[PDB]
Amino acid sequence: DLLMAQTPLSLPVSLGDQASISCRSSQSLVHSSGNTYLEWYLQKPGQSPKLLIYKISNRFSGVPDRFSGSGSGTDFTLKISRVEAEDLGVYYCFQTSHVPPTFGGGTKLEIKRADAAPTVSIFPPSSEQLTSGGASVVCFLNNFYPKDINVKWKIDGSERQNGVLNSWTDQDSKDSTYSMSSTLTLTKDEYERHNSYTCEATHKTSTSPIVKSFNRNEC
Amino acid sequence: EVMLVESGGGLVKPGGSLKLSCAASEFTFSTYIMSWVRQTPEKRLEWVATISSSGTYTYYRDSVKGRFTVSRDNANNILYLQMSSLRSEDTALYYCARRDYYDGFTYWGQGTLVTVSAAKTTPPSVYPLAPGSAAQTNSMVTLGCLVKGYFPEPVTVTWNSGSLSSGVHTFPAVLQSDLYTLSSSVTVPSSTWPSETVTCNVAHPASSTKVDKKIVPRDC
Numbered sequence: 001d002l003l004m005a006q007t008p009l010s011l012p013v014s015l016g017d018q019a020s021i022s023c024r025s026s027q028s029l030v031h032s033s034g035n036t037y038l039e040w041y042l043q044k045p046g047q048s049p050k051l052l053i054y055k056i057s058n059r060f061s062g063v064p065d066r067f068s069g070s071g072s073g074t075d076f077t078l079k080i081s082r083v084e085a086e087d088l089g090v091y092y093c094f095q096t097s098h099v100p101p102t103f104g105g106g107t108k109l110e111i112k113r114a115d116a117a118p119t120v121s122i123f124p125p126s127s128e129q130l131t132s133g134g135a136s137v138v139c140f141l142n143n144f145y146p147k148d149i150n151v152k153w154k155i156d157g158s159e160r161q162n163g164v165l166n167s168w169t170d171q172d173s174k175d176s177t178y179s180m181s182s183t184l185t186l187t188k189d190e191y192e193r194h195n196s197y198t199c200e201a202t203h204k205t206s207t208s209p210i211v212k213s214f215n216r217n218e219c
Numbered sequence: 220e221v222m223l224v225e226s227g228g229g230l231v232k233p234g235g236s237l238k239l240s241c242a243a244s245e246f247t248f249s250t251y252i253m254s255w256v257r258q259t260p261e262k263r264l265e266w267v268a269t270i271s272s273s274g275t276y277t278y279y280r281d282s283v284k285g286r287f288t289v290s291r292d293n294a295n296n297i298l299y300l301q302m303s304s305l306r307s308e309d310t311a312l313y314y315c316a317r318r319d320y321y322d323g324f325t326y327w328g329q330g331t332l333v334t335v336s337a338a339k340t341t342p343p344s345v346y347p348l349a350p351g352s353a354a355q356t357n358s359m360v361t362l363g364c365l366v367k368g369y370f371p372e373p374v375t376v377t378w379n380s381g382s383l384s385s386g387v388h389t390f391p392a393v394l395q396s397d398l399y400t401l402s403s404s405v406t407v408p409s410s411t412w413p414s415e416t417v418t419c420n421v422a423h424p425a426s427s428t429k430v431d432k433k434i435v436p437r438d439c
């Protein structure tokens with residue numbers, strides 16, 4: 001029934017610039033009291049959510065004065081005025097003017113830093129994993145920006161799309177980069193029928209793929 | 220500081236019951252409205268339940284009504300959430316929060332994980348990830364640990380018992396076929412490996428396992 005819609009899903013912003021986040025409810029958040037119980041929470045990577053703003057615009061104790069809240073009726077905005085690295089995470093609006101209390105779906109604040117290309121490392125299956133009858137081929141792509149990246153695997157030249165799972169860390173507050181793992185999971189038997197394994201990373205930082213490769217028979 | 224510590228989350232079969240608890244300290248617990256809020260595996264936040272300071276009034280999200288009961292022990296400063304007829308939608312991290320009336324969820328615990336599934340608890344297999352022969356870069360070597368085939372979440376990964384912190388990335392687990400897998404990477408100077416040991420320590424509290432995998436050069 002009552003929806004809390006946030007835009008955008010993701011918001012890149014430079015340190016020092018102002019970020020603005022919107023929360024639009026489907027009905028008026030004016031409670032029967034005449035007050036409006038719209039709150040804003042931030043979730044830092046690996047942390048619990050924490051309160052920023054209550055009653056539209058009031059800051060919780062200890063919240064930096066750079067965070068501010070505004071709006072009325074159905075439209076609310078959280079502004080962060082001179083963004084710092086530690087401000088990254090997911091920001092959620094929340095309403096308790098009308099049962100049932102409801103959160104927004106969240107907006108990621110992303111720190112916009114200089115483009116950085118990934119450092120790519122490839123890893124054959126370990127001897128012990130093979131000893132157990134499985135085979136995962138692992139590629140790490142570390143310390144890159146922006147987040148968007150496509151990883152192609154090739155096995156003896158045949159592009160391979162099935163068996164490949166990609167996982168990303170949250171953005172690192174220390175350097176504003178992302179890292180990702182791309183894992184190709186095969187049966188030992190399939191793995192042992194092929195010799196050349198390659199993970200290829202296409203990122204806007206280069207025209208050419210960053211390719212890391214091994215031959216099953218080398219080392 | 221005000222503190223809130225959840226207990227009791229873990230793996231429960233569909234249709235089952237579990238009761239979470241939350242120990243409160245450093246504030247007058249019995250003065251305050253208290254709440255449970257959950258975060259789904261996809262990171263959506265859902266309010267679950269609220270209980271008034273005295274316990275007289277209780278409130279629930281529609282999807283949990285009749286199945287969950289929020290309660291509190293004001294003598295011993297504990298908030299509870301009894302859960303029954305558990306379903307897969309109920310899989311989430313459960314936070315207890317202090318609710319300062321209309322001034323917000325001011326304090327939150329770290330959360331306790333609940334997993335509703337028919338699958339069996341399975342400890343991880345931990346596999347080393349060491350570089351090829353010669354292609355070990357040779358000034359900065361990246362190593363890793365593949366943590367494969369465990370259930371339920373979570374696992375804790377450290378390197379050299381936490382001593383090795385810098386240059387570490389531990390990737391979120393992905394669930395497939397009722398088993399989770401994750402990897403962790405660490406980059407270290409050549410002077411430090413393999414001539415000094417690098418070990419990934421992997422803890423899986425659900426199976427009470429704790430495994431320390433040393434990364435050693437490939438036999439080549």
Ligand SMILES: O=C(O)CCCC(=O)OC[C@@H](NC(=O)C(Cl)Cl)[C@H](OP(=O)(O)Cc1ccc(NC(=O)C(F)(F)F)cc1)c1ccc([N+](=O)[O-])cc1
Nearest residue numbers: 096099101252254266269270271272276278318319320321
């Ligand atoms: O309970 C009474 O006193 C009689 C009922 C009407 C009343 O005067 O109080 C309504 C008020 N309830 C209470 O204060 C009880 Cl906790 Cl004693 C109210 O209840 P209602 O307006 O009847 C329905 C309602 C239910 C849940 C919430 N919000 C939450 O539970 C929140 F998500 F915010 F935590 C808000 C309103 C309300 C206000 C604030 C909060 N809260 O969590 O901060 C909860 C409840």
